[model samples]
Target: MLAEKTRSIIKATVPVLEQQGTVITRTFYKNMLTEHTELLNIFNRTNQKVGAQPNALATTVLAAAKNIDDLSVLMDHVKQIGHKHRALQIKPEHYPIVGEYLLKAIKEVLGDAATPEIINAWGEAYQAIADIFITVEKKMYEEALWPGWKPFEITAKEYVASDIVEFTVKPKFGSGIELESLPITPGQYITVNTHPIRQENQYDALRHYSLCSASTKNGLRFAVKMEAARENFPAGLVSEYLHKDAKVGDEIKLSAPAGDFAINKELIHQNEVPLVLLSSGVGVTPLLAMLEEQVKCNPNRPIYWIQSSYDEKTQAFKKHVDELLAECANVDKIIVHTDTEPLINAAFLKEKSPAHADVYTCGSLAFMQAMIGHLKELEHRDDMIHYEPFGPKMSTVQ
Candidate 1:
């Protein structure tokens, strides 16, 4: 608990913090790394390189600030970040250091505006925020320490020819994880961890892969596409491993399943709800789960399954979807392509769908962004749109 005065101050300054969230977050990282270089291992270098760390940190701070008056609002996403922090081996002891530096940055940024009351409020907020993380993450660590089988494995490497692959991971052994039962949900993903090469100074790198199947017993399922390399670069660090060196039967450690983007379960009760599940190439994984879940849970629902691919040869799960849609009258699959023999008048999809509906999608960050933008242009309700990013959380702050 923070001092009452600080608590009150924190409450008042939230608007300020929320508006300048990213700037302060950048400072927080700057101060943290400068003061405690050893904690570098706790942050994702990829995020650091792309400046996503600041974006992530800013989003978290803003979320907390917006809901500061009602901390319970934090419950929706705390567990997810808790799992992330645990994955990075972050500890409670690190929180105080982070909190102090964060406060310092806030004061420095606010300068003449930093009154004692203002400083106190920010202090209370940071502590309040850190306390939630510390408590939730402590429980997570306890669970990980207990005896259990960590379920992910790295196997046969194929050079990442593309950004995403929608296929079976093909693990070895006779356990025979059933693909039909794996319960991946829309707006959720599974973590894929792999061992690092000698010089990377990495132990095991963890990445999140969008899941392609929603069955609770679905074969240990996931979809991955190699991220594109830089102009002069040959390949991505992790994707290169997954493609070239990983082989069947190799075990990679994974944390227990944790994510909140489970297709809002409430949707399962309705049939004939207009539904649009869209994806591009590798992004099809989560959309597949949404489609599968909706179809499995409610056969009567009218589903508009839309996908954009280069062509039939490079597309995935066409037969699987066809098999399911074959049994139903209300489900439809729409595939989009850039290649057309004769000129088509325009892109395959309209900016908007035929009707108001539950819109769920997964794809590359850019693809999803563009798709959302297009949908927005059609005056669609954003509340109905749901998406899950295909990546890892580098910090609890995010």
Candidate 2:
């Protein structure tokens, strides 16, 4: 247990953290990469640039600190982050360093405005918060690490335009390089970096993109869609590189598969294998993995794959999903095209998920927010609904 003074100090500083959270947390990251160069491999550089993820994490940490009196209140925030931590493969070894630097950042940011008591208090609180997530992740690492994955190599960089392309990788050397066999689990994404390009919309770009394959094969793949290029909202440097700049055999720096959404071994044996995956536009990458996993390992387990595309012409992976599901049993699928046409049947999905079973979604914030709202009104338990947000990993607590 942490000292009471620590909790009180953390509680008091919550608002300040919230107010200047982005700068402090970002500074924490900037320091991490600069001083502890090895850690540069671990963090998502894109969010660091865009200032979206760091802000969310700063706000989340502040919220958690204010509710430090009741640890359970952190679950809502934890659940959202667990998926990212797991996806990123964050380990216990990663936390204490982060905790130490975070406290330092707080002191540096607050300067003489901070009391010694405040500094000690915030330090304690960060450690406690770090331990909670670190422990959860240690268990995840033990569960997912297998001996079968191959050597890491960038396999293909097919241009999907001048911007979006399928960025694929496989374990090379003697490991059978299979770009077509990676699991397509929803919410799972990978980190990317480009050879720093200076365009109006790109810089030392790093980003995360969802896997679009409906996971049936055995390759790691994602759709690299370029972001709006601008100073702060720079376009995808690495993704754009792979699409337009990186060579066919060029390797984009990547971290191991990281995220928090997979069946716990305890619940892996649950009776109702209830799984429903939904997505829109480029969000379908992660959902495809879930569908394919069920098809391969748990063919008898039930699944519902609901997808909405902008239109027939711009639609993503619709035909691929249709063909994959046709070859696999114990799966029901639907494709709703909204941009080009209208919903063929408004009630089409009602029967598939009548029980409001386990639901997973990934896409734009607006898409995810709206889908969760709709699922809740339709009787889906909040606990049963999960989403892989279309942004950076949430382990940005610093």
Candidate 3:
């Protein structure tokens, strides 16, 4: 617990943090990475270059300061981040290093206004918050299915769409895990660590791809969409490598699956509430897995799959999705080709979605923001409308 004076001082700084939070975090990352180059292996270079990481950190810090009196309110948020930290193999030793640089960056950015008293209070507060993360992450580490990164051999690779390739992999010899015993929850994603030789990349790159299927009968399956370079940002490092360089029979390192997004198991067996799965582009990966699970458990339950894609060429998993939906007794599948048809809007959702439904959505940040806004306008309950943005959840908090 923090002292009363310390909590008041931190709360008073929320206005300042809101104004210059991003600057402080950007400086922290730049200086910390420069002083400790080895950390580049864990941080995503693309997210840093695009400024998303700094934005995410700033948002989290500001939220902590605003709610300094009681941090239990943020436990759900912390748990989500803790899962990612565990997947990346982050340890308690790294918390102090982050705290030291974070305080330095705050002082460097705030300059004269950053008084000794203020700094002291923040120093104490940061440790308290760090301790929370440490405790939460410790439990996650213990519950993880596998320890550290393990090698998985790509047994098959086939293009499901023009730019999307589905790769099937199995645990290699000595990984100490059997295919039949592996447990996978629907809507979970696995982290892949790679060291791409192209573009003179010196540090290892890590990416999280959602599992396309929960069953391991055909090995663990994941789909990667080729990310082409845009105006300023470079193409996705890991996505490009998986699409161009990686081939069947190649070995890749992966951590255990981790994510909070999932279907409500209790509701799966009941037909009272319909399941609404929405996605755009490659965001369908996790939703597809959930669809399979729902049907496997109880095909009588109602389901609605609303998907949007560029065109016929880029519509991923078309055949596979069709086959699964065919087995379901009550299902409605809608595929919108943005090239010719209109995009999904509030009016469209009003007509298509049922009155009481368990909604799940995944897509780019913009797509999710729009969909959530529309859902809110339709008066969907906050707890019923679940979504997973491609980037950090903090980025979409506001």
Candidate 4:
């Protein structure tokens, strides 16, 4: 248990954390990665280059520090993060390494401002939080689909949209072993490990792609949007490889289905509340799975599908969504072709969504933030809103 004095010291530094958290974390990753180059394979390089991962960690650390007295308040956030940690094969041993570098960075950034009491308090707080993650992640690892990663063969591949392509894969069954499909939740994602083409020889680049289709007896399906090079950021390694290099017979390693962006089935059934799924671009992948599940279980359930894409050429799964509309009487859809139509604003959502609706949204970081702002403006409860950022577990909720 944390002593009262230690807790007070942690709370005292919350303001400093808010101000310099990102700088401290940026220093932390630079120093740590320089010392431990092997971690490059474990962390996402693109997010690191774009500085999103460090900012995300900084935000989470500050949130934990602010709630040092009662970590249970952050239990939901902890579980959401634990899912990603488990998927990345993060273990208990990694926490100590992280804590060491984190403290060093704090001291380096704050200089004389970081007193001994402050550092000690942070150490204790970090350990307490890590213990919780270690316990939660242990349970998840035990319940993982396979021990680590297994070989999967791509059975089919096709272009679903202009830059988006879908691949269907299944576990290779041969010899004395007969492996079936891994069961997954509607909003979960699987990590794919590959050595995509790079300027330097890329060893193992990891990326998480959402399962676009509901599970089947034989296989699972996912879609990848080929990300071109931006002004500063390099082209997406995994996405480019999957789009240009990977073929139907090519094999890749896959982690178990992971993440917590899922529907509340019990509440949906009990209250028979309206369901709203909002997505932009390739963010529709996981929500499409959720839609399929909801349609399968309750065909009469009132549901709304709001999607935004560049244009029709970039819109995916149009035929499938149209099929659902034809089959389900209570399903409604609103598509915004941003190039031709005005953006979906708060006023449009107010005109269509139910007064008391359960909403799930997934999209690019900016799109999710915008949707969240609109939802809050319309007086939606926090419990009624769920979202997963494409890159990291960062909460933009105010």
Candidate 5:
């Protein structure tokens, strides 16, 4: 427990944090990465360049400060982040480095207004928050399927859509793992560490790709969509490498599956409540796994598959999804091609989705915001609506 004075001081900084959190976090990342270049292997350069990481850190810091009195309220969010960190192989030792840099950034950004007492209070607060993460991550690491990165051999690679490629991989020889015995949770994702020759002088790049199929009968399956450079952002390095340089027979390293976005297990066998899956572009990967699990478990359960894409040519897993839906006794499938059809809105969801449906959505940040807003407007219970935005979850905190 934090001291009363410490908690109050942190609480008081909430306003300034909300205003200049990004600046502090941006400086933190800049200084930390400069000092500890080895961390480049763990952090995503693309996210850093686009300011997504800094923005996410800022949001998380502000949230923590606002709820400093009782951090348990943020456990759900913290656990989600812990899963990601564990998958990335972040260790207890990394916490102090982050804490030190965070405090330094706070002091640097706050300038003369950052009194010694303020710095000391924030230091204690950061340690408390770091302790929470360290403890949560410790359990996640222990429960992880395997420690660090394990080698997987790509057995198959095929284009599923315009720019999406489905890669099937099996644990490499001598990995001492059996595919059929591996536990796979529907809607979870695996982190891949890649070293692209195209990126000179850069360390390993990490990316998380959702499992497109929960069954390991054909080994692990994931889909990667080539992210093209737009405006000021550069093309996704790992995605581009996987799409172009990687091939069947190539070896890649993947950490165990990790993510909290999943179907409600308690309601999986129930028929009273419908299952609603909403996805866009490559976000359909995890939802597809959920659909497969649902059909395999209980085909009688009602389901709604609402998907948005550019067009028929860009629609991924169409044939597979149709086949799964065909097995379901009660299913409603809506495919919206934004190029020729209207985007999904509140009226569309209200008409298509059942009032009592357990909703799961995953997509680009913009699409997620739109769908979540529309779902909220339709009075969907917060607990029933689960989402996995393609980017940092904290970016959507506000």
Candidate 6:
């Protein structure tokens, strides 16, 4: 618990701190990475290079400070990131090192404005914040399928779209311990570790790919879309390598299934309620799993899939989606080619969906925000809608 004065201090400084959050986070990463080069093995160098990770951390920290009274409010966000930390094998010991450098960066950035009292308050608050994450992550680590990274062999690979490649992998045994098949929730994801030799640096990049298969008993399936360098975003390393260098017989390392976005048992058994699934680009990966499983269990349930891509050329799993639509009992789909069709709106949603519907959405940051905003206006219950962002969530405060 924080003191009243401390809480007031934290709340008072949120406005100032939020403005400088990105700079402080950037500095912290710069100094920490400079001192601890080994951490590069776990951190995504591509995100760091493009300033996405730093900005994300900034927003997350600001959100925490803004709601310092009850840290539990941030549990959803914490657990979301906790899944990634567990996947990256981030241990409890790493928290203090991060706390130390984070405070150092704050003090350095604020300079004279950072009084001894203020710095000490932030230090204490940081420990409290760290404890919340540490507790949540500890639970995740214990619940993982197995400790550390496990080797898996890619049994098959196929190009589902222009740049999207689906890889199916099964566990490779050799550690003298029996590995049991892990149960998978439809919208969960797994962390993949890949060594991509970019330029002169030979560092490993860690990435999360959504589990695209309905069954985990056979193995796991994930889709990777080769990310090209654009105006602001840099080219992805692991994605490109997976698309170009990886083969069916090759081996790769993966963490256990992790993520909070999924179809809960309640929704699975509720045959009367309708389900609305929305996605764009490669974000459709996990939702496809839910679509498959839901139709299998409740063929008569009302289900709507509103999916979009740049155009027909970039659309993936068209044949699979079409087959499911034709074969399933009560399923409808609306595929959008962004170049030709207008963006998805509330009017389209109201026309297609029922008043009482459970919605699951995953897509780019912009698309998620747009859909969420429109859903709220359409009187969808806050608890009825669930979403998962493709990368570092841009707006953590919400």
The top-ranked prediction according to TM-score is: 3
For residues 87-143, could you state the per-residue lDDT of candidate 3 as single tens digits?
898899998889999889989999989999888999999999999999999988888
RMSD (Cα, Å) for all candidates, in order, is: 5.5, 5.4, 1.3, 2.3, 1.5, 2.1
> Where's the lowest-lDDT run of ten residues in candidate 1?
340-349
User: Is candidate 4 or 5 superior in TM-score?
Assistant: 5
Q: 96-166 in candidate 6: lDDT tens per residue?
A: 99989988988989998988888888888988888888889999988887778888889989888988999
Tell me the deviation in Å of residue 67 in model 2: 2.7
lDDT of 5 by residue, 75-111 (tens): 8889999989999999999888988988899889898
Model 1 segments more than 4 A misplaced: 1-27, 34-38, 62-94, 104-119, 134-187, 198-203, 215-218, 230-235, 264-266, 310-314, 338-352, 370-383, 391-398
Every candidate's lDDT:
0.62, 0.63, 0.89, 0.83, 0.89, 0.83
- Candidate with more favorable, higher TM-score: 4 or 6: 6
Q: Per-residue lDDT tens digits of candidate 4, residues 1-398? A: 78899999988888888889778878998899889888887876667557356666567877787778888988877888888888888899999999999899999999999999889988998898899999999999998877677788999998888999999887776422134555778999988888877657456788889998666565779999999887976677778888988889999888888888899877555336888999999999998998888887777778889988999999988987877767666877888899998888899889978878999999887888888999999999989999987875555544
Model 6 lowest lDDT segment of ten: 175-184
Give me the runs in candidate 5 sitting further than 4 Å from their true place: 230-232
Question: What TM-score does model 2 achieve against the real structure?
Answer: 0.73
lDDT per residue for candidate 1 within 247-312, as digits (tens), equals 656665444444555566776777655777877777776676677777777877778888777766
C-alpha-based local distance difference test score of model 3: 0.89
Look at candidate 5 and tell me the lDDT of residue 395: 71
Query: What are the per-model numbers of colliding residue pairs?
Result: 31, 33, 0, 0, 0, 0
TM-score of 4: 0.92
The lowest-lDDT stretch of 10 consecutive residues in candidate 5 is: 48-57
lDDT by residue (168-266, candidate 2, tens digit) is 765565554444544334445555544455554433344556665444244567776665567655555554455566665655554445565543333
Winner on TM-score (2 vs 6): 6
In lDDT terms, how accurate is model 2? 0.63
Give the Cα error of residue 22 in candidate 6, in Å: 2.9
Shift in Å, residue 55, candidate 5: 2.8
